[PDB]
A = this chain, B = another copy of it.
């Protein structure tokens, strides 16, 4: 029985529309050489992001609205058009939910629900609190150390974050009575959420097998005459990564402290809680077995590139195992809105960015940068290239397409302005990695951690812009000095 409407934030519709309209009106006075469709899709993308920020019609609704408008203006069809030879020349909005990252994240959310249900997450949280609970900064450093250990085995960051780290964070934040979407989020939750995101960044940066973009950069460099290698990457990133490991947590604890900084009796507290919870149970045993097996498959995926191990089918496998095994009912899975909400909005944003690249925007930016910076010494050229490869990820969501589109061109530019090949390659790779510290759609982990509710998006973007300045500083300066020490240039 319904009487009145639901409260909507019509105020938030002011900024987006305005922006879009403005850019639309600017269409005729566009930079030139740019397709009008591209500029219109760009305006729509910007307005959609502004809506995600201002938060009218939560991310799901505003992204749905953006996709709808994209459909109305004729910028994107619904059914994949064909070239009469079988090729797809324009993908539709429905050919957007067939994305791997989205379904992976969703199934990982489901697995985490199963964890929290069987009681395993609480156990792990009370354990890591027994051992690191004192000085919650210790908790942050434990999770970042865990992520760093895992980066060497699991080559899909989204997995480490949604299947391993995020459950830990949720369990701990539940044990400290820090529930999201409340003022009690700032107790300890947001600290761990943000630290986990940035630790995932560090892990991705330390190991060449931290994600697909790194392999893409490896392939492209080898295409331009320079062979990366697991040991080279590690030996070049070890130092800057440690410097970041030491600085980042400190600046975060100074800028975003958890209101609960000391639990001096956490040891006896956790021991009492573990004694009350009783011994380990059968469903907990089964869920642990499944989690370990899925971890094993995600690892095997790094050495054997096989469809049976795509890092998403593995999640489908683990969840159907939870179903056949009884620990998880299908009704429990059809619940857990987070999965489907992510599916929706992440897939839509990725599709919009794909249309942004297909219509010729990013290619024009590459060509413009190629044609603009001519008479400068290779150092300032490297500086500008890095800054651009950083602040361009605001127009991307994959992390892979960004490199696929802008690595080889930037590398060619640098090598043409005298810059040495190895330095340029590794710097641009580290930059393509640390892009993540911009947005909530940069990569999977950000989409997971910046929307769960522990962190408002405004704080996210601010702190991430700052930490991005810091990441650029560290990597550029120090990693350059270090790659000079060992003979990378």
Contact = CB atoms under 8 A, between A and B. Distances in A.
B2 A119 contact: yes
Interface stretch (A71-79, A125-133, A375-383): A71-79
Interface string A47-85: 000000000011011001101100110101111100001
Contacts of A319: 64
A225 interface: no
A328 B85 CA distance: 43
A344 to B, nearest CB: 8
A337 B80 CA distance: 27
Nearest to A332: B6
A320 interface: yes
A68 to B, nearest CB: 5
Contact of A320 (B3, B68, B119, B310): B68
A61 B319 CA distance: 9
A281 interface: yes
B312 A94 contact: yes
Interface in A230-262: none
Contacts of A335: 335, 337
A13 B87 CA distance: 41
A326 interface: yes
A93 interface: yes
Given A87-B87, A98-B95, A326-B8, A307 B71 contact: yes
Contacts of A103: 94, 97
Contacts of A331: 337
A485 interface: no
A100 interface: yes
A283 B6 CA distance: 10
Contact of A100 (B61, B94, B317, B337): B94
A313 B68 contact: yes
Contacts of A7: 326
A334 interface: yes
Contacts of A337: 331, 334-335
Contact of A2 (B77, B94, B118): B118
Contacts of A317: 68
A308 interface: yes
A54 to B, nearest CB: 14
Given A94-B99, A119-B1, A313 B71 contact: yes
B65 A324 contact: yes
A341 interface: yes
A316 B348 CA distance: 12
B313 A283 contact: no
A333 interface: yes
A98 B94 contact: yes
Given A78-B310, A99-B94, A330-B341, A117 B2 contact: yes
For the complex of A and B, the 9 pairs showing the least CB-CB separation, nearest first, are A334-B337, A5-B326, A78-B310, A77-B307, A86-B87, A61-B323, A95-B98, A94-B98, A98-B98
13 contacts: A2-B119, A2-B281, A4-B283, A58-B330, A60-B333, A64-B319, A67-B316, A68-B313, A68-B316, A78-B312, A80-B98, A335-B337, A340-B340
